[PDB]
Amino acid sequence: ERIFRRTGGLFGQVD
């Protein structure tokens, strides 16, 4: 089990 997190747009960049 792994956490999905979306990239860009509404969401800040992560790495």
Added chain:
Amino acid sequence: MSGGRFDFDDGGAYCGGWEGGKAHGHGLCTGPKGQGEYSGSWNFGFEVAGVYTWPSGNTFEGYWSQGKRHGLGIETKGRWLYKGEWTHGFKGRYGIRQSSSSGAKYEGTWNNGLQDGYGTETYADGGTYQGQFTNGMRHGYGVRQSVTETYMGEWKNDKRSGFGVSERSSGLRYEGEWLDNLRHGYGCTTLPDGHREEGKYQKVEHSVEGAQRAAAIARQKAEIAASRTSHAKAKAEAAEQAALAANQESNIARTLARELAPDFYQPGPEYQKRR
């Protein structure tokens, strides 16, 4: 000030506040095919405090930074529960893992998501280890208490290895060298009445001196571990408050998403329903 529902081409969606083109305020976000759900607060594109629910019903309740579990939080994963600190997506540095079914727990420090440093591991049968861990394993010096035997000494890859002292509450004790939880090398065994026994399993007095020195060290390492365990316990309790704050923001986000998109399916409650 503004918000709404944004549907992604993979079946997920964000529904909540946004400002300047970034998620802001409160919001709920589902993953591909609508699988998995964050519900909580946001600040300009980043989660702050909220709940992630996996399709299995497992949950992270707590604080976030830069897109990752970070700060205080509680993770419920079925076989066990973790409460305490998180660092950039990983358990640690201080926290407690507690079995869902039994008494077994670990309380202490973590590194790279593994038991590592110093802590207290309590086993199902109520016995303990207190002392050093490396990469999830008893490694270094530490004290293994049974349920009234006690080992004090050296550990290597989760096994007694090196100089160590094993003393039972009957007086049956062994001081010497070890290998793989087994008496191995120079070292005697004292009986309850006082009868000393085999030398090799002169240079035995050296192995007994090394054993009793390592037992003394192990007792100090357990003392350090006991301090670390106490801090881990305080951070687990702070994480209970973090989980409650996260659920507060999650419920605000559910309400907003309900107002903004009455028809949008929030999958989190059904995930948790029979878990």
